[PDB]
Amino acid sequence: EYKTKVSRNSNMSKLQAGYLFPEIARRRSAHLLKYPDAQVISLGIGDTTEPIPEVITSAMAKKAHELSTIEGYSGYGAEQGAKPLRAAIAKTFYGGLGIGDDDVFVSDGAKCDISRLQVMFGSNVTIAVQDPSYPAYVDSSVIMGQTGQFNTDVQKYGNIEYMRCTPENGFFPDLSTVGRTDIIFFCSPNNPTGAAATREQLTQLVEFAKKNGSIIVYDSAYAMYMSDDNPRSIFEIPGAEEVAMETASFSNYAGFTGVRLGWTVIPKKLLYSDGFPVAKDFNRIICTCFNGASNISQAGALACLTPEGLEAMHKVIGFYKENTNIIIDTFTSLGYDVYGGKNAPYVWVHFPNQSSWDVFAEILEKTHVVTTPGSGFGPGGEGFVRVSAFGHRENILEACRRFKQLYKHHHH
Amino acid sequence: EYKTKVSRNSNMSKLQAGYLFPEIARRRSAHLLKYPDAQVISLGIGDTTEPIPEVITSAMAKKAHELSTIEGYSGYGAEQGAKPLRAAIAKTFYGGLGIGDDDVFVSDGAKCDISRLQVMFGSNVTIAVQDPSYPAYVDSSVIMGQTGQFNTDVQKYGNIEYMRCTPENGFFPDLSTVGRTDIIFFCSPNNPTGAAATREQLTQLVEFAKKNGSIIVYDSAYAMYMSDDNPRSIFEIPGAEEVAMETASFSNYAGFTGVRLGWTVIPKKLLYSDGFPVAKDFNRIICTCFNGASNISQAGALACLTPEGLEAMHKVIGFYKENTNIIIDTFTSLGYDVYGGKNAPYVWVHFPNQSSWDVFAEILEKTHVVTTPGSGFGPGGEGFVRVSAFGHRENILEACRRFKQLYKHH
Ligand SMILES: Cc1ncc(COP(=O)(O)O)c(/C=N/[C@@H](CCC(=O)O)C(=O)O)c1O
Numbered sequence: 098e099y100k101t102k103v104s105r106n107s108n109m110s111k112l113q114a115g116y117l118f119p120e121i122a123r124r125r126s127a128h129l130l131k132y133p134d135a136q137v138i139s140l141g142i143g144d145t146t147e148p149i150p151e152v153i154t155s156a157m158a159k160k161a162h163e164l165s166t167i168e169g170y171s172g173y174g175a176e177q178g179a180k181p182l183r184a185a186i187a188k189t190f191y192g193g194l195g196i197g198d199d200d201v202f203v204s205d206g207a208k209c210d211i212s213r214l215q216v217m218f219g220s221n222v223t224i225a226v227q228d229p230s231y232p233a234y235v236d237s238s239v240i241m242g243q244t245g246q247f248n249t250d251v252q253k254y255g256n257i258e259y260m261r262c263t264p265e266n267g268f269f270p271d272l273s274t275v276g277r278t279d280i281i282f283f284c285s286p287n288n289p290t291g292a293a294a295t296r297e298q299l300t301q302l303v304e305f306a307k308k309n310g311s312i313i314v315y316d317s318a319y320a321m322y323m324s325d326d327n328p329r330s331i332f333e334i335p336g337a338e339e340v341a342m343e344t345a346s347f348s349n350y351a352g353f354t355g356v357r358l359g360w361t362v363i364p365k366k367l368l369y370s371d372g373f374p375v376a377k378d379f380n381r382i383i384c385t386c387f388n389g390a391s392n393i394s395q396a397g398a399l400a401c402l403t404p405e406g407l408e409a410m411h412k413v414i415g416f417y418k419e420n421t422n423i424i425i426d427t428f429t430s431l432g433y434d435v436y437g438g439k440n441a442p443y444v445w446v447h448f449p450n451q452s453s454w455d456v457f458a459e460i461l462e463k464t465h466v467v468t469t470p471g472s473g474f475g476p477g478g479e480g481f482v483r484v485s486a487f488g489h490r491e492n493i494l495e496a497c498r499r500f501k502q503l504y505k506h507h508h509h
Numbered sequence: 510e511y512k513t514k515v516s517r518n519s520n521m522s523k524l525q526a527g528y529l530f531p532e533i534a535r536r537r538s539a540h541l542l543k544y545p546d547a548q549v550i551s552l553g554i555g556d557t558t559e560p561i562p563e564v565i566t567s568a569m570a571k572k573a574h575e576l577s578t579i580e581g582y583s584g585y586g587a588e589q590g591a592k593p594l595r596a597a598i599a600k601t602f603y604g605g606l607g608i609g610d611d612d613v614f615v616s617d618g619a620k621c622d623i624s625r626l627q628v629m630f631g632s633n634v635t636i637a638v639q640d641p642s643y644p645a646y647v648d649s650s651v652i653m654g655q656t657g658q659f660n661t662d663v664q665k666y667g668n669i670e671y672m673r674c675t676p677e678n679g680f681f682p683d684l685s686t687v688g689r690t691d692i693i694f695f696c697s698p699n700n701p702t703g704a705a706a707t708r709e710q711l712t713q714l715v716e717f718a719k720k721n722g723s724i725i726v727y728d729s730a731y732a733m734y735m736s737d738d739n740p741r742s743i744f745e746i747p748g749a750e751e752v753a754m755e756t757a758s759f760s761n762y763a764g765f766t767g768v769r770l771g772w773t774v775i776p777k778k779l780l781y782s783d784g785f786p787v788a789k790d791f792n793r794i795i796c797t798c799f800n801g802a803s804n805i806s807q808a809g810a811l812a813c814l815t816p817e818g819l820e821a822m823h824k825v826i827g828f829y830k831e832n833t834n835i836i837i838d839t840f841t842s843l844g845y846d847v848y849g850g851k852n853a854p855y856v857w858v859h860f861p862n863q864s865s866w867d868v869f870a871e872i873l874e875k876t877h878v879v880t881t882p883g884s885g886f887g888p889g890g891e892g893f894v895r896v897s898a899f900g901h902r903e904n905i906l907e908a909c910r911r912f913k914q915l916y917k918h919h
Pocket residue numbers: 118141142143144205206207208209231233284288316318345346347348353354358359800
């Protein structure tokens with residue numbers, strides 16, 4: 098066979114396996130070959146399942162129809178997003194926090210922004226992540242050349258600061274033990290643990306970033322699930338404007354997982370070591386490497402940020418929070434240590450003295466329920482399994498019945 | 510003022526100015542501050558202007574409504590795109606060319622794929638581009654660290670092979686003069702020259718890539734504007750499957766510039782030097798750095814690839830081709846050397862003894878028409894101006910009247 102003379106990107110070669118969620122899909126498929134009649138319930142990937150509220154879909158359909166009219170047609174949008182949408186995001190989520198319309202960048206989702214931010218930061222920054230954490234932070238870092246090779250002894254890529262979050266530290270890093278890095282990716286409520294940082298903890302985080310001269314990338318994709326009285330935006334912490342940016346999404350709020358609409362906020366006071374504003378480089382990236390979020394998706398997001406849209410999202414979120422409570426109650430009654438669930442639409446179940454991949458496999462094999470093994474979120478996730486609360490009510494209830502039957506004999 | 514201790518990405522520092530099209534928009538905005546009541550006609554950025562056909566928008570509206578129902582709701586899609594859409598693209602544009610549904614990757618547009626491909630290739634590849642060419646190829650290369658600094662003497666970033674395309678050579682490079690690189694970005698029809706490579710020229714290009722062990726990134730964003738009997742896909746050239754991939758979009762075909770939907774095709778026989786299939790690394794990038802094109806946009810694209818959708822696109826394309834002829838005739842009658850327009854919805858006009866930014870500024874100040882300075886497309890673009898044919902018919906006619914009035918006595 099013919100081969101080119103182009104060398105494979107050595108950063109791609111560093112990756113240990115495929116992306117976590119496609120790997121789970123492969124195991125789900127293999128399971129269906131083994132059990133063709135199985136009624137599989139997926140509580141693995143956090144994919145929303147309930148319909149989008151009509152007030153929001155109606156706005157998207159209206160935009161689509163408008164595109165067939167002379168007056169209503171629009172072509173390229175400014176890559177930063179429609180001004181009324183930037184304004185609505187700035188006021189709804191950041192009113193009172195000194196965030197301007199021009200600080201908001203509308204995306205086709207948080208996953209995509211994480212990687213565009215990584216292109217922006219480039220190959221020479223070092224990063225810290227919560228351990229465990231959403232795997233895209235680590236994987237994007239490896240792809241960009243910010244890491245060394247994977248070390249199989251410790252299950253870590255070289256040169257990443259993995260900040261261990263455990264039951265014993267309340268799922269917040271012991272910052273006095275964390276080495277200095279350029280970037281700190283910090284998710285609150287955390288995926289997969291569900292832990293929401295308190296005001297005191299976020300204050301510590303901002304102080305740590307300030308002393309170390311680091312940039313915090315704060316992922317607030319589940320913040321509207323907050324039940325405890327904790328900050329929902331990093332910008333609630335005075336000084337955050339000098340060290341932090343925030344990335345978020347409509348995926349988990351309106352069921353926009355397939356529609357694609359998020360945003361990133363970069364404040365004016367966030368500067369590189371030479372005084373250059375970080376937002377100006379992000380603006381160059383989003384103008385050069387992106388051509389804007391879908392106009393229909395932007396119209397849907399604008400409709401979300403109205404009294405009727407907010408009411409609708411609140412109902413969607415409330416439904417998933419009720420699913421979460423059903424799952425928490427099930428595992429608690431089974432005698433498990435169950436974490437998260439309070440501030441996030443998933444639960445983090447402790448399966449000590451087992452491999453999380455083994456637990457994943459056992460649950461799938463015996464109950465036909467897909468979960469996510471904790472080790473998929475980094476070595477700090479070993480010993481845990483994440484169970485998503487996204488599902489139709491009957492599917493949640495059925496999965497819990499199956500869990501109760503599987504684990505009935507494990508505890509008194 | 511507080512500053513972090515994070516060093517700015519040195520690749521961002523390399524960029525000589527802002528991205529071309531936002532800079533044009535800034536100048537347009539400045540013009541409207543100067544003259545608030547100016548009736549500005551925008552022929553700079555290639556932004557489509559005519560409505561999307563109803564058959565296509567109806568499909569998008571239907572998908573939106575379906576998302577509010579239990580049965581019709583869908584969440585995350587496959588990051589590669591819906592299988593029926595991949596199948597429709599594969600058969601419609603590549604039927605008979607040995608392209609499978611799994612070779613197609615649905616994107617939110619060609620600009621985005623160019624940059625995701627560049628993340629995939631990484632910092633250690635060298636690139637070649639046509640000179641002039643669409644500026645994203647060069648700027649994405651700089652951002653990814655594949656280049657040196659901008660050299661102001663020659664108006665080139667270091668370590669990029671700029672392939673000279675001129676009226677004299679029919680805007681196809683003399684490949685005997687082109688140095689070996691890892692990647693060759695090649696646009697046909699080319700933006701901004703409008704030049705469509707002939708079958709013979711593409712055969713040369715494929716042979717050149719094969720000898721050099723290079724990967725061609727073929728951008729076919731304007732291929733449906735082809736009037737001459739030239740290949741529309743690189744895969745029409747036997748052997749392309751070993752050396753080429755193709756990126757395209759619905760932007761210029763259905764007016765999806767704001768809707769966002771394109772694709773890339775990476776064939777099975779395209780391998781790195783270690784035998785690793787390039788498509789497998791692209792798949793990892795689109796699974797890790799992307800979450801799929803919008804489900805509504807995918808539904809729109811699926812409706813495009815039907816008899817009614819193709820008919821509707823053909824009509825829109827035809828309208829813009831008519832606009833292009835109006836523009837060609839205007840500049841030709843004024844005595845300018847005008848290139849392109851035959852196979853693409855823009856014209857490439859030669860303005861001797863003048864910088865293209867000065868011509869841009871003069872045209873905007875005097876006629877309130879926005880154009881694109883040729884130098885924005887690389888050093889080979891100096892002395893030229895691109896005029897887009899995307900516009901309402903009355904605006905094209907008005908712009909041409911303004912050009913004639915300005916230039917007829919000179
Ligand atoms: C902390 C966090 N940040 C970003 C994302 C991606 O959100 P979008 O790209 O806007 O849908 C997600 C979504 N995570 C899901 C979906 C998986 C994925 O996006 O790869 C999960 O962990 O199952 C997330 O949890």
